[PDB]
Amino acid sequence: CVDLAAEIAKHCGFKYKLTIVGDGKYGARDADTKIWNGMVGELVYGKADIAIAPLTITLVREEVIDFSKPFMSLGISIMIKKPQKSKPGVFSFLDPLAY
Amino acid sequence: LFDRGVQMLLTTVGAFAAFSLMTIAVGTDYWLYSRGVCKEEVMTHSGLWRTCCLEGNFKGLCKQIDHFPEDADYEADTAEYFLRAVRASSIFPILSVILLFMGGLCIAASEFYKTRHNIILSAGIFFVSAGLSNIIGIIVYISANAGSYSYGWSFYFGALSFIIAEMVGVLAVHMFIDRHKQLRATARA
Amino acid sequence: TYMRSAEPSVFVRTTAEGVARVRKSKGKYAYLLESTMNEYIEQRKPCDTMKVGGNLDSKGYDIATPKGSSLGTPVNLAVLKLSEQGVLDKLKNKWWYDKGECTSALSLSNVAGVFYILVGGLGLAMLVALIEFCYKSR
Amino acid sequence: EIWMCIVFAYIGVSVVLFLVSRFSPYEWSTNEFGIFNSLWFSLGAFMQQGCDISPRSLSGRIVGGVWWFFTLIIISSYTANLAAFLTVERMVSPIESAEDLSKQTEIAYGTLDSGSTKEFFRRSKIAVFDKMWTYMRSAEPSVFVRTTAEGVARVRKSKGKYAYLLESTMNEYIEQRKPCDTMKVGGNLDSKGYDIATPKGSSLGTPVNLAVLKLSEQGVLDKLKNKWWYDK
Amino acid sequence: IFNSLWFSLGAFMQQGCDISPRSLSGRIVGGVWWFFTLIIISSYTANLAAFLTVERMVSPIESAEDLSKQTEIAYGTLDSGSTKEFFRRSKIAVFDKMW
Amino acid sequence: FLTVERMVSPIESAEDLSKQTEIAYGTLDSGSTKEFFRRSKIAVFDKMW
Amino acid sequence: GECTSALSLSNVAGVFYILVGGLGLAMLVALIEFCYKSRAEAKRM
Numbered sequence: 001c002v003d004l005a006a007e008i009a010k011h012c013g014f015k016y017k018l019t020i021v022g023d024g025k026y027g028a029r030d031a032d033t034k035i036w037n038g039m040v041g042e043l044v045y046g047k048a049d050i051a052i053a054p055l056t057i058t059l060v061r062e063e064v065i066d067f068s069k070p071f072m073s074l075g076i077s078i079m080i081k082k083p084q085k086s087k088p089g090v091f092s093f094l095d096p097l098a099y
Numbered sequence: 100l101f102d103r104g105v106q107m108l109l110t111t112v113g114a115f116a117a118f119s120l121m122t123i124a125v126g127t128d129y130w131l132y133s134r135g136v137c138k139e140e141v142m143t144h145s146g147l148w149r150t151c152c153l154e155g156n157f158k159g160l161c162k163q164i165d166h167f168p169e170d171a172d173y174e175a176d177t178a179e180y181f182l183r184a185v186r187a188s189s190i191f192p193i194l195s196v197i198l199l200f201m202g203g204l205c206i207a208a209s210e211f212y213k214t215r216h217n218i219i220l221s222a223g224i225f226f227v228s229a230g231l232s233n234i235i236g237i238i239v240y241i242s243a244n245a246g247s248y249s250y251g252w253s254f255y256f257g258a259l260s261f262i263i264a265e266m267v268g269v270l271a272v273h274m275f276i277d278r279h280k281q282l283r284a285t286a287r288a
Numbered sequence: 289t290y291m292r293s294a295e296p297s298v299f300v301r302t303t304a305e306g307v308a309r310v311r312k313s314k315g316k317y318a319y320l321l322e323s324t325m326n327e328y329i330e331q332r333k334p335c336d337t338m339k340v341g342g343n344l345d346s347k348g349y350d351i352a353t354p355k356g357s358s359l360g361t362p363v364n365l366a367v368l369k370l371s372e373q374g375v376l377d378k379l380k381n382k383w384w385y386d387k388g389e390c391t392s393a394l395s396l397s398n399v400a401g402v403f404y405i406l407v408g409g410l411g412l413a414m415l416v417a418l419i420e421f422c423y424k425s426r
Numbered sequence: 427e428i429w430m431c432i433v434f435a436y437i438g439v440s441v442v443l444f445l446v447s448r449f450s451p452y453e454w455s456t457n458e459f460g461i462f463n464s465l466w467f468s469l470g471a472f473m474q475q476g477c478d479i480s481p482r483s484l485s486g487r488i489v490g491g492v493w494w495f496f497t498l499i500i501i502s503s504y505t506a507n508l509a510a511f512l513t514v515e516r517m518v519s520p521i522e523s524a525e526d527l528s529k530q531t532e533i534a535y536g537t538l539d540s541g542s543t544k545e546f547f548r549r550s551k552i553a554v555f556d557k558m559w560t561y562m563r564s565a566e567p568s569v570f571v572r573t574t575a576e577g578v579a580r581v582r583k584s585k586g587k588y589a590y591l592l593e594s595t596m597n598e599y600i601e602q603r604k605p606c607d608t609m610k611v612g613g614n615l616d617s618k619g620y621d622i623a624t625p626k627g628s629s630l631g632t633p634v635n636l637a638v639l640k641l642s643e644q645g646v647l648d649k650l651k652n653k654w655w656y657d658k
Numbered sequence: 659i660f661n662s663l664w665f666s667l668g669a670f671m672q673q674g675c676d677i678s679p680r681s682l683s684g685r686i687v688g689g690v691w692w693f694f695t696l697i698i699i700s701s702y703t704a705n706l707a708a709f710l711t712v713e714r715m716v717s718p719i720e721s722a723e724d725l726s727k728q729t730e731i732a733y734g735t736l737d738s739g740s741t742k743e744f745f746r747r748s749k750i751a752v753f754d755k756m757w
Numbered sequence: 758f759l760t761v762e763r764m765v766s767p768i769e770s771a772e773d774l775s776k777q778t779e780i781a782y783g784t785l786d787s788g789s790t791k792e793f794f795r796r797s798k799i800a801v802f803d804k805m806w
Numbered sequence: 807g808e809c810t811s812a813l814s815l816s817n818v819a820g821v822f823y824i825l826v827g828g829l830g831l832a833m834l835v836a837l838i839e840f841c842y843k844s845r846a847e848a849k850r851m
Contacts (some may be wrong), residue, residue: 228411234407238400238404241401245395
């Protein structure tokens with residue numbers, strides 16, 4: 001994102017200052033008090049002018065702030081351990097021919 | 100191979116030598132010289148039960164061998180669990196020791212009531228079975244380990260016990276062969 | 289329906305623990321997460337985790353701007369320009385793959401089965417011979 | 427351990443065959459399988475060679491059959507593993523070019539920590555050259571070495587695990603120095619040249635320029651290089 | 659002697675034998691010859707398999723010196739030019755042998 | 758025969774596609790696919806272009 | 807829409823067919839010989 005921020009400023013020709021959100025949250029809405037936090041709260045309550053960060057484009061976020069077109073697409077994947085060498089079975093000498 | 104007095108004493112000393120060698124092999128923990136945790140990585144002299152430190156910070160500290168590791172052992176098939184069970188209990192080396200002792204008792208029992216020629220055959224069968232049990236124990240131990248190293252003197256004490264057990268088993272069956280020959284020779288005459 | 293009706297619970301408190309749980313299961317656990325995070329960790333030491341299959345769903349990461357701001361528009365064209373120019377792909381390749389951190393003799397275990405069969409056959413032959421001798425004696 | 431267990435199994439099979447073929451007096455003899463003959467039969471069976479006798483009883487035939495199966499599996503395994511050894515040895519391809527070095531990662535390679543060779547990789551546009559630069563700039567510990575002399579010993583110390591990139595003239599000379607344990611592989615990555623330097627406006631500019639060309643065409647330069655690189 | 663030659667030939671080709679030695683020394687000879695035959699035939703089959711699997715072709719010429727040492731392969735230059743004059747005026751032994 | 762068949766592995770990714778030459782590959786005469794490769798600075802895609 | 811490592815039996819089925827065909831041919835040859843020998847004996851005896 002630092003590289004992307006540098007490229008974003010170069011295109012539009014504006015100066016910028018990188019900062020880390022103190023809350024350390026991407027953004028959510030409280031169920032009771034209905035107050036946003038994280039990155040979303042910074043842009044909604046005017047603590048920053050832009051959020052160049054891996055912020056998911058979602059329905060609830062799109063209503064309160066404006067999202068550019070996704071610079072990176074993704075989705076749910078499966079993580080498994082590497083297959084690794086399997087210890088041969090006791091009766092592994094029959095392997096070259098099918099049962 | 101000849102005479103009768105020599106064959107009996109040779110069988111007796113061979114049986115006793117095999118029994119003592121196998122008991123030492125089971126009893127002494129010098130079976131595998133390999134790097135491993137003895138309580139950093141350090142060369143250790145292992146056995147069937149307890150791997151022990153060698154040339155380390157605290158030499159001579161002996162610790163039991165971890166046969167069923169905890170803390171997410173990841174499990175495996177029932178075959179691997181059976182293999183670890185045999186390796187940990189060492190049912191086959193212990194069975195070899197038991198068979199050697201039973202063969203020794205049978206050979207000793209041959210002096211009393213020598214007319215029961217089947218005792219010699221029993222001793223021969225027991226010695227052959229003890230050799231087979233030693234073979235299975237060695238194979239199981241090596242397979243369990245395979246999951247730089249060198250084998251200690253107790254491993255080769257056990258390997259030498261198998262050779263003597265079969266050699267005594269050959270003589271024990273040979274003695275039974277001649278005893279039945281003596282019966283046939285006198286029956287015709 | 290499988291994970292809800294699973295014992296023990298297969299839900300991880302945090303993403304980092306889920307990475308460790310896979311490495312502590314030796315292939316008995318599978319973790320589901322975003323593809324970008326999976327591709328990142330796959331390129332990290334000791335490189336024992338891999339990503340399989342396609343994406344179950346489709347999402348996107350975007351640059352957020354306050355509502356009613358003048359920078360909302362030029363940023364949106366900036367993302368499109370870089371994507372078509374290949375800048376975005378190069379930056380992903382740079383921070384994911386460019387900066388990523390990723391015979392033998394036959395042992396006794398390969399023929400232990402044939403050894404066991406041989407010894408069992410020897411034992412069976414001895415038992416058969418003993419049974420025959422006992423029957424002939426009787 | 428497989429050979430040890432083969433010997434042990436051979437002894438056990440021979441003893442068991444002798445026992446099951448002789449112990450019963452009701453078969454007394456009817457079979458020529460003594461302890462000497464049993465060992466010979468077992469040895470001939472393992473070598474898959476013809477036998478002058480075969481077991482006839484049920485137990486003896488069981489022993490013979492299991493020994494035959496064991497022998498067949500073991501001989502097949504030995505031949506297959508020998509074939510695998512020889513084949514895998516046959517496909518071993520030494521890294522004979524910069525492209526081959528780039529495509530691999532087992533052998534580490536670095537350059538001087540400060541010099542013209544290091545800067546050529548950084549400002550490069552060929553596909554292989556930038557790939558090498560990306561590899562070294564992101565690697566721990568650093569493959570770059572401050573001095574060539576220390577880095578030269580790194581190749582010898584690392585028993586082939588570390589490769590050094592340097593000038594071809596020094597590569598050829600270092601290869602010819604004792605103990606001659608290091609060799610130059612592949613072709614030159616770029617093209618440079620050693621020139622005689624003269625001050626601007628000096629009267630020795632043109633004659634030296636024509637002198638160098640004269641020595642190259644007549645073979646003096648080639649003779650001089652071969653004298654101090656190969657003959658010496 | 660004739661039958662011993664026949665026995666050894668049959669043992670090497672793994673084709674059985676009408677007679678087998680009965681003495682201890684003859685059996686020792688037979689056993690060591692059988693082990694030798696087994697190892698050699700397995701090695702031959704394994705090497706043939708390795709050959710047929712992986713195909714390697716090499717050039718008879720790999721350097722300048724190899725070209726001059728042999729004579730089965732011919733070599734020459736242009737009728738008149740810089741490449742021909744180089745060999746004519748060369749003083750190194752390797753190039754002078756080529757010229 | 759058997760070892761060669763085991764060594765045979767079919768085409769999986771564009772990286773494997775770029776290296777081999779037995780199977781030719783081509784895009785449309787126009788459209789966004791050609792301009793992707795032409796503007797592609799990626800060495801994997803640059804060599805295919 | 808509208809849409810391993812170990813050797814399989816299919817690779818060696820032909821040799822099985824050849825073996826069983828040879829067994830059948832041997833059985834047929836044996837029966838033919840037996841029938842011919844039986845025919846010869848009855849006429850002679």
